[PDB]
Amino acid sequence: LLVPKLTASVTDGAVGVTVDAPVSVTAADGVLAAVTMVNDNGRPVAGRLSPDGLRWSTTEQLGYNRRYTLNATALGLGGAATRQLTFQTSSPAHLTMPYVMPGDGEVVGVGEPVAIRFDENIADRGAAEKAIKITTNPPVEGAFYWLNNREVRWRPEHFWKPGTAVDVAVNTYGVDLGEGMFGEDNVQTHFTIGDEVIATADDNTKILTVRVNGEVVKSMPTSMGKDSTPTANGIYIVGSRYKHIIMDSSTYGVPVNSPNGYRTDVDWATQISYSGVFVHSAPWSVGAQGHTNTSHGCLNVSPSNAQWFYDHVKRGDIVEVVNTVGGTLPGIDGLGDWNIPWDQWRAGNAK
Numbered sequence: 001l002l003v004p005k006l007t008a009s010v011t012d013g014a015v016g017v018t019v020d021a022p023v024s025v026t027a028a029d030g031v032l033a034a035v036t037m038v039n040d041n042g043r044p045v046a047g048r049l050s051p052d053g054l055r056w057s058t059t060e061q062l063g064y065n066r067r068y069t070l071n072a073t074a075l076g077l078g079g080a081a082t083r084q085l086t087f088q089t090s091s092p093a094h095l096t097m098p099y100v101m102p103g104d105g106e107v108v109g110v111g112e113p114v115a116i117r118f119d120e121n122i123a124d125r126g127a128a129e130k131a132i133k134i135t136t137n138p139p140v141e142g143a144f145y146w147l148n149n150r151e152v153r154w155r156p157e158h159f160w161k162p163g164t165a166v167d168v169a170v171n172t173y174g175v176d177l178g179e180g181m182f183g184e185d186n187v188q189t190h191f192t193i194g195d196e197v198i199a200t201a202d203d204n205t206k207i208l209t210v211r212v213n214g215e216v217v218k219s220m221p222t223s224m225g226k227d228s229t230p231t232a233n234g235i236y237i238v239g240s241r242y243k244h245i246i247m248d249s250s251t252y253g254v255p256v257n258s259p260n261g262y263r264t265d266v267d268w269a270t271q272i273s274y275s276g277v278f279v280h281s282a283p284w285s286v287g288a289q290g291h292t293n294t295s296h297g298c299l300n301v302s303p304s305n306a307q308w309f310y311d312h313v314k315r316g317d318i319v320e321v322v323n324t325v326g327g328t329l330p331g332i333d334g335l336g337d338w339n340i341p342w343d344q345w346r347a348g349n350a351k
Protein backbone atom coordinates (compact mmCIF):
# COMPACT_ATOMS: atom_id res chain seq x y z
CA LEU A 1 0.00 0.00 0.00
CA LEU A 2 2.69 2.58 0.90
CA VAL A 3 5.51 3.50 -1.46
CA PRO A 4 8.92 3.23 0.00
CA LYS A 5 10.69 6.38 1.27
CA LEU A 6 14.39 7.36 1.14
CA THR A 7 16.12 9.70 3.59
CA ALA A 8 19.78 10.68 3.22
CA SER A 9 22.09 12.51 5.59
CA VAL A 10 22.97 14.98 2.77
CA THR A 11 20.78 17.03 0.47
CA ASP A 12 21.04 17.09 -3.30
CA GLY A 13 22.94 20.20 -4.34
CA ALA A 14 24.53 20.80 -0.95
CA VAL A 15 27.94 22.47 -0.60
CA GLY A 16 30.27 22.58 2.39
CA VAL A 17 29.28 19.09 3.54
CA THR A 18 31.59 18.32 6.46
CA VAL A 19 33.61 15.11 6.46
CA ASP A 20 33.69 14.68 10.24
CA ALA A 21 30.79 12.21 9.94
CA PRO A 22 29.75 9.37 7.63
CA VAL A 23 27.15 9.81 4.93
CA SER A 24 24.08 7.63 5.36
CA VAL A 25 20.82 6.65 3.67
CA THR A 26 17.77 5.13 5.33
CA ALA A 27 14.68 3.44 3.93
CA ALA A 28 11.19 3.46 5.44
CA ASP A 29 8.24 1.33 4.31
CA GLY A 30 10.77 -0.73 2.38
CA VAL A 31 14.41 -1.80 2.29
CA LEU A 32 17.50 -0.54 0.50
CA ALA A 33 18.04 -2.62 -2.63
CA ALA A 34 20.99 -0.66 -4.00
CA VAL A 35 23.18 2.13 -2.67
CA THR A 36 26.30 3.48 -4.37
CA MET A 37 28.39 6.58 -3.77
CA VAL A 38 31.08 7.69 -6.22
CA ASN A 39 33.44 10.62 -6.36
CA ASP A 40 33.83 13.11 -9.21
CA ASN A 41 36.21 10.71 -10.91
CA GLY A 42 33.61 7.89 -10.74
CA ARG A 43 35.46 5.75 -8.23
CA PRO A 44 33.25 4.11 -5.58
CA VAL A 45 33.25 4.94 -1.87
CA ALA A 46 33.29 2.08 0.63
CA GLY A 47 30.02 1.54 2.52
CA ARG A 48 27.97 -1.00 4.43
CA LEU A 49 24.27 -1.85 4.50
CA SER A 50 22.80 -2.95 7.83
CA PRO A 51 21.55 -6.56 7.97
CA ASP A 52 17.90 -5.50 8.13
CA GLY A 53 18.35 -3.51 4.91
CA LEU A 54 17.22 -0.21 6.44
CA ARG A 55 20.46 1.77 6.73
CA TRP A 56 23.56 2.27 4.62
CA SER A 57 26.59 4.28 5.65
CA THR A 58 30.02 5.09 4.33
CA THR A 59 32.78 3.19 6.13
CA GLU A 60 35.94 5.05 5.04
CA GLN A 61 37.19 8.60 5.36
CA LEU A 62 35.43 11.02 3.01
CA GLY A 63 37.65 13.53 1.28
CA TYR A 64 37.91 17.29 1.31
CA ASN A 65 37.18 19.12 -1.92
CA ARG A 66 35.19 16.32 -3.50
CA ARG A 67 31.92 16.14 -5.42
CA TYR A 68 30.14 12.90 -4.50
CA THR A 69 27.10 11.34 -6.16
CA LEU A 70 24.83 9.05 -4.15
CA ASN A 71 22.37 6.72 -5.92
CA ALA A 72 19.86 4.78 -3.83
CA THR A 73 16.86 2.56 -4.53
CA ALA A 74 14.37 1.33 -1.93
CA LEU A 75 11.92 -1.50 -2.62
CA GLY A 76 8.86 -2.36 -0.60
CA LEU A 77 5.73 -4.42 -1.00
CA GLY A 78 4.12 -1.12 -2.07
CA GLY A 79 6.57 -0.21 -4.83
CA ALA A 80 9.98 1.39 -5.43
CA ALA A 81 11.70 4.75 -5.04
CA THR A 82 15.04 5.88 -6.48
CA ARG A 83 16.95 9.07 -5.75
CA GLN A 84 20.21 10.58 -7.00
CA LEU A 85 21.99 13.20 -4.87
CA THR A 86 25.17 15.14 -5.66
CA PHE A 87 26.96 17.22 -3.05
CA GLN A 88 30.31 18.94 -2.45
CA THR A 89 32.40 18.52 0.70
CA SER A 90 34.30 21.22 2.57
CA SER A 91 37.10 22.89 0.63
CA PRO A 92 39.77 23.99 3.15
CA ALA A 93 42.07 26.94 2.69
CA HIS A 94 44.59 25.27 5.01
CA LEU A 95 45.11 22.04 6.89
CA THR A 96 46.59 21.64 10.38
CA MET A 97 47.88 18.42 11.94
CA PRO A 98 47.66 17.93 15.72
CA TYR A 99 50.42 16.28 17.73
CA VAL A 100 49.59 14.89 21.16
CA MET A 101 51.79 14.35 24.21
CA PRO A 102 52.39 12.24 26.17
CA GLY A 103 52.90 9.21 24.00
CA ASP A 104 50.43 6.38 23.54
CA GLY A 105 50.71 3.73 26.23
CA GLU A 106 53.12 5.74 28.36
CA VAL A 107 53.17 5.86 32.14
CA VAL A 108 53.76 9.43 33.29
CA GLY A 109 53.94 11.35 36.54
CA VAL A 110 51.19 13.17 38.46
CA GLY A 111 52.05 16.52 36.87
CA GLU A 112 51.71 15.58 33.20
CA PRO A 113 49.15 17.70 31.34
CA VAL A 114 47.49 16.55 28.16
CA ALA A 115 49.17 18.49 25.34
CA ILE A 116 47.68 19.04 21.87
CA ARG A 117 50.03 21.01 19.60
CA PHE A 118 48.81 22.04 16.17
CA ASP A 119 51.29 22.77 13.41
CA GLU A 120 49.42 25.99 12.49
CA ASN A 121 47.89 28.86 14.44
CA ILE A 122 44.31 28.10 15.50
CA ALA A 123 41.90 30.95 14.76
CA ASP A 124 38.90 29.31 16.51
CA ARG A 125 40.27 27.86 19.76
CA GLY A 126 36.77 26.97 20.94
CA ALA A 127 36.24 24.75 17.90
CA ALA A 128 39.49 22.98 18.69
CA GLU A 129 38.54 22.47 22.35
CA LYS A 130 35.11 21.15 21.37
CA ALA A 131 36.77 18.61 19.06
CA ILE A 132 39.01 17.16 21.81
CA LYS A 133 37.40 14.50 24.02
CA ILE A 134 39.28 13.63 27.22
CA THR A 135 38.18 10.59 29.23
CA THR A 136 39.51 10.06 32.75
CA ASN A 137 39.12 7.06 35.06
CA PRO A 138 38.57 7.75 37.87
CA PRO A 139 36.82 10.76 36.35
CA VAL A 140 38.17 14.14 37.43
CA GLU A 141 37.34 17.71 36.48
CA GLY A 142 39.79 19.38 34.12
CA ALA A 143 40.01 22.28 31.72
CA PHE A 144 41.78 23.61 28.64
CA TYR A 145 44.31 26.46 28.58
CA TRP A 146 46.33 27.70 25.60
CA LEU A 147 50.07 28.23 26.03
CA ASN A 148 50.40 30.00 22.64
CA ASN A 149 48.45 30.14 19.39
CA ARG A 150 49.26 26.51 18.50
CA GLU A 151 49.34 24.46 21.72
CA VAL A 152 46.51 23.79 24.20
CA ARG A 153 46.88 21.94 27.51
CA TRP A 154 44.33 20.07 29.62
CA ARG A 155 44.79 19.26 33.29
CA PRO A 156 42.89 18.93 36.57
CA GLU A 157 42.93 21.35 39.48
CA HIS A 158 45.44 19.27 41.44
CA PHE A 159 48.09 16.74 40.52
CA TRP A 160 46.66 13.54 39.11
CA LYS A 161 45.83 10.59 41.30
CA PRO A 162 48.19 7.66 40.65
CA GLY A 163 46.52 4.90 38.67
CA THR A 164 44.34 7.21 36.60
CA ALA A 165 43.72 6.28 32.98
CA VAL A 166 43.63 9.18 30.51
CA ASP A 167 42.27 8.93 26.98
CA VAL A 168 42.63 11.71 24.42
CA ALA A 169 40.64 11.72 21.18
CA VAL A 170 41.52 14.67 18.96
CA ASN A 171 38.64 14.54 16.43
CA THR A 172 39.69 17.37 14.15
CA TYR A 173 39.23 15.73 10.74
CA GLY A 174 36.49 17.64 8.94
CA VAL A 175 36.31 20.32 11.65
CA ASP A 176 36.65 23.99 10.68
CA LEU A 177 39.15 25.43 13.15
CA GLY A 178 38.60 28.98 11.88
CA GLU A 179 39.44 30.99 8.75
CA GLY A 180 39.06 27.92 6.56
CA MET A 181 41.67 25.88 8.42
CA PHE A 182 40.52 22.28 8.79
CA GLY A 183 41.98 19.32 10.63
CA GLU A 184 44.37 17.17 8.60
CA ASP A 185 43.46 14.00 10.52
CA ASN A 186 42.28 12.66 13.85
CA VAL A 187 44.67 11.53 16.54
CA GLN A 188 43.98 9.14 19.43
CA THR A 189 46.33 8.53 22.39
CA HIS A 190 46.09 6.96 25.85
CA PHE A 191 48.29 7.15 28.94
CA THR A 192 48.33 6.26 32.62
CA ILE A 193 49.48 8.05 35.74
CA GLY A 194 52.12 6.26 37.81
CA ASP A 195 53.67 6.90 41.20
CA GLU A 196 53.64 10.34 42.80
CA VAL A 197 57.21 11.68 42.54
CA ILE A 198 57.84 15.23 43.77
CA ALA A 199 61.36 16.61 44.19
CA THR A 200 61.82 19.83 46.13
CA ALA A 201 64.89 22.05 45.71
CA ASP A 202 65.08 24.41 48.70
CA ASP A 203 67.53 27.29 48.26
CA ASN A 204 67.76 27.67 52.05
CA THR A 205 69.38 24.21 52.34
CA LYS A 206 70.73 23.64 48.79
CA ILE A 207 69.24 20.14 48.87
CA LEU A 208 67.01 18.58 46.21
CA THR A 209 64.85 16.05 48.09
CA VAL A 210 63.06 13.37 46.08
CA ARG A 211 59.80 12.03 47.60
CA VAL A 212 58.00 8.99 46.18
CA ASN A 213 54.39 8.67 47.39
CA GLY A 214 55.31 10.99 50.24
CA GLU A 215 58.48 9.22 51.40
CA VAL A 216 61.96 10.71 51.17
CA VAL A 217 64.09 8.38 49.02
CA LYS A 218 66.98 10.66 47.98
CA SER A 219 68.59 13.89 49.21
CA MET A 220 70.86 15.51 46.62
CA PRO A 221 73.18 18.45 47.31
CA THR A 222 72.66 20.99 44.55
CA SER A 223 74.06 24.21 43.13
CA MET A 224 71.35 26.31 41.47
CA GLY A 225 71.56 29.57 39.56
CA LYS A 226 73.86 32.24 40.89
CA ASP A 227 72.28 35.53 41.95
CA SER A 228 72.82 37.03 38.46
CA THR A 229 71.15 34.11 36.62
CA PRO A 230 68.97 32.59 39.33
CA THR A 231 66.68 29.59 39.25
CA ALA A 232 63.03 30.61 39.25
CA ASN A 233 60.83 29.37 42.06
CA GLY A 234 57.73 27.35 41.34
CA ILE A 235 56.43 24.06 40.00
CA TYR A 236 58.27 22.42 37.10
CA ILE A 237 57.04 19.42 35.09
CA VAL A 238 59.71 16.84 34.25
CA GLY A 239 60.16 16.55 30.49
CA SER A 240 62.73 14.65 28.42
CA ARG A 241 65.85 12.92 29.71
CA TYR A 242 69.27 12.47 28.09
CA LYS A 243 72.24 10.26 28.90
CA HIS A 244 74.24 13.19 27.51
CA ILE A 245 73.32 16.42 25.76
CA ILE A 246 75.03 19.55 24.49
CA MET A 247 73.22 22.38 26.30
CA ASP A 248 73.35 25.30 23.84
CA SER A 249 72.07 28.57 25.28
CA SER A 250 71.15 29.72 21.75
CA THR A 251 68.44 27.05 21.89
CA TYR A 252 66.89 29.03 24.77
CA GLY A 253 67.26 32.53 23.32
CA VAL A 254 70.70 33.50 24.67
CA PRO A 255 73.72 33.85 22.33
CA VAL A 256 76.55 31.53 23.34
CA ASN A 257 79.13 34.33 23.01
CA SER A 258 77.04 36.68 25.21
CA PRO A 259 77.68 37.30 28.91
CA ASN A 260 75.22 34.60 30.07
CA GLY A 261 75.66 32.25 27.12
CA TYR A 262 77.12 28.76 27.18
CA ARG A 263 77.58 25.64 25.07
CA THR A 264 78.31 22.70 27.41
CA ASP A 265 78.24 18.92 27.04
CA VAL A 266 76.68 17.40 30.17
CA ASP A 267 75.73 13.90 31.30
CA TRP A 268 72.53 12.55 32.85
CA ALA A 269 70.34 15.54 32.05
CA THR A 270 66.63 15.79 32.85
CA GLN A 271 64.76 18.72 31.31
CA ILE A 272 62.39 20.58 33.60
CA SER A 273 61.66 23.80 31.72
CA TYR A 274 61.43 24.89 28.10
CA SER A 275 63.52 27.89 29.18
CA GLY A 276 66.38 25.43 29.56
CA VAL A 277 66.54 24.37 33.20
CA PHE A 278 67.86 20.83 33.62
CA VAL A 279 68.85 18.64 36.52
CA HIS A 280 72.22 17.30 35.37
CA SER A 281 75.66 16.01 36.28
CA ALA A 282 78.01 18.86 37.26
CA PRO A 283 81.39 17.39 38.27
CA TRP A 284 82.94 20.87 38.14
CA SER A 285 80.68 22.21 40.94
CA VAL A 286 80.56 19.26 43.37
CA GLY A 287 82.42 21.42 45.88
CA ALA A 288 79.63 24.05 45.78
CA GLN A 289 76.69 21.62 45.71
CA GLY A 290 74.89 21.89 49.04
CA HIS A 291 76.70 25.18 49.75
CA THR A 292 76.54 27.89 47.08
CA ASN A 293 74.83 28.61 43.76
CA THR A 294 77.06 28.73 40.70
CA SER A 295 75.02 27.84 37.63
CA HIS A 296 73.12 29.63 34.87
CA GLY A 297 69.87 28.28 36.36
CA CYS A 298 70.32 24.54 36.05
CA LEU A 299 70.14 22.30 39.12
CA ASN A 300 73.71 21.04 39.31
CA VAL A 301 74.07 17.72 41.16
CA SER A 302 76.71 15.06 41.37
CA PRO A 303 77.26 12.50 38.59
CA SER A 304 75.78 9.71 40.67
CA ASN A 305 72.77 11.80 41.75
CA ALA A 306 72.10 12.95 38.17
CA GLN A 307 72.18 9.36 36.96
CA TRP A 308 69.90 8.40 39.85
CA PHE A 309 67.50 11.16 38.79
CA TYR A 310 67.65 9.98 35.17
CA ASP A 311 66.88 6.41 36.25
CA HIS A 312 64.14 7.10 38.83
CA VAL A 313 62.24 10.19 37.62
CA LYS A 314 59.92 10.07 34.59
CA ARG A 315 58.12 12.49 32.31
CA GLY A 316 55.37 14.22 34.29
CA ASP A 317 57.01 13.94 37.70
CA ILE A 318 57.36 17.25 39.57
CA VAL A 319 60.24 19.45 40.69
CA GLU A 320 59.31 22.32 43.03
CA VAL A 321 61.86 25.09 43.58
CA VAL A 322 61.45 27.27 46.68
CA ASN A 323 63.20 30.16 48.42
CA THR A 324 65.50 31.30 45.62
CA VAL A 325 66.16 34.94 44.78
CA GLY A 326 64.48 34.40 41.44
CA GLY A 327 60.94 35.10 40.40
CA THR A 328 58.36 32.47 39.54
CA LEU A 329 58.53 30.22 36.52
CA PRO A 330 56.08 31.48 33.86
CA GLY A 331 52.88 29.47 33.62
CA ILE A 332 53.24 29.39 29.81
CA ASP A 333 56.88 28.19 29.83
CA GLY A 334 55.98 24.80 28.37
CA LEU A 335 56.53 22.90 31.62
CA GLY A 336 55.19 25.59 33.96
CA ASP A 337 51.49 24.84 33.72
CA TRP A 338 50.89 24.31 37.45
CA ASN A 339 51.98 27.87 38.29
CA ILE A 340 48.76 29.23 36.72
CA PRO A 341 46.08 29.54 39.45
CA TRP A 342 43.24 27.10 38.95
CA ASP A 343 40.56 29.81 38.71
CA GLN A 344 42.50 31.34 35.81
CA TRP A 345 43.29 28.03 34.13
CA ARG A 346 39.70 26.81 34.41
CA ALA A 347 38.36 30.05 32.96
CA GLY A 348 40.59 29.40 29.96
CA ASN A 349 41.62 31.68 27.12
CA ALA A 350 39.74 30.31 24.11
CA LYS A 351 38.43 33.78 23.20
Ligand SMILES: OC[C@H]1O[C@@H](O)[C@H](O)[C@@H](O)[C@@H]1O
Nearest residue numbers: 101102113114115237334335
Ligand atom coordinates in the same frame (compact mmCIF):
# COMPACT_ATOMS: atom_id res chain seq x y z
O1 LIG B 1 51.15 16.53 27.18
C1 LIG B 1 52.20 16.70 28.08
C2 LIG B 1 52.84 18.05 27.84
O2 LIG B 1 53.43 18.47 29.13
C3 LIG B 1 54.78 19.04 28.93
O3 LIG B 1 55.17 18.92 30.22
C4 LIG B 1 55.76 18.22 28.04
O4 LIG B 1 56.15 19.05 26.93
C5 LIG B 1 55.13 17.05 27.41
O5 LIG B 1 54.83 15.99 28.38
C6 LIG B 1 53.89 17.69 26.78
O6 LIG B 1 54.23 18.78 25.91
Ligand SMILES: N[C@@H](CCC(=O)O)C(=O)O
Nearest residue numbers: 250254255256257258261
Ligand atom coordinates in the same frame (compact mmCIF):
# COMPACT_ATOMS: atom_id res chain seq x y z
N1 LIG C 1 74.69 31.52 19.88
C1 LIG C 1 75.19 32.53 18.98
C2 LIG C 1 74.01 33.44 18.64
C3 LIG C 1 72.79 32.53 18.44
C4 LIG C 1 71.47 33.23 18.18
O1 LIG C 1 71.43 34.47 18.02
O2 LIG C 1 70.46 32.50 18.10
C5 LIG C 1 76.40 33.24 19.61
O3 LIG C 1 76.40 33.85 20.67
O4 LIG C 1 77.49 33.13 19.07
